[PDB]
Amino acid sequence: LAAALAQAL
Ligand SMILES: *C(=O)c1ccc(-c2ccc(C(=O)OCC)cn2)nc1
Ligand SMILES: *NNC(=O)c1ccc(-c2ccc(C(N)=O)cn2)nc1
Ligand SMILES: CCc1ccccc1
Ligand SMILES: Cc1ccc(C)cc1
């Protein structure tokens, strides 16, 4: 989940 968001950055 963290990675799913972190792709934005
Ligand atoms: C949420 O974005 C997210 C994405 C990916 C993963 C994740 C966890 C573990 C592995 C892995 O290769 O584990 C080897 C033990 C890969 N990706 N977790 C949360
Ligand atoms: N928000 N995330 C990024 O901007 C981001 C872009 C690209 C990468 C990345 C990581 C690792 C490789 C590689 N070939 O090992 C390439 N690009 N990370 C984050
Ligand atoms: C969008 C500005 C920025 C860039 C990279 C990381 C954080 C913030
Ligand atoms: C999804 C992601 C992976 C690595 C960095 C450094 C940033 C984002």
Method: X-ray
- The runs of H, that is alpha helices, within 1-9 are 2-6
Residue 8, CA atoms < 13 Å, CB-side half-sphere: 5
Residue 3, CA atoms < 13 Å, CB-side half-sphere: 0
d(CA 2, CA 8): 11
Displacement of CA 7 from its chain's centroid (Å): 4
- C-alpha 9 – ligand 3 centre gap (Å): 7
Ligand 2 atom nearest to CA at 8: 1
Quick check: helix, strand or coil at residue 9?
A: coil
Q: Which residues have CB under 6 Å of ligand 1?
A: 1-4
- C-alpha 6 – ligand 1 centre gap (Å): 13
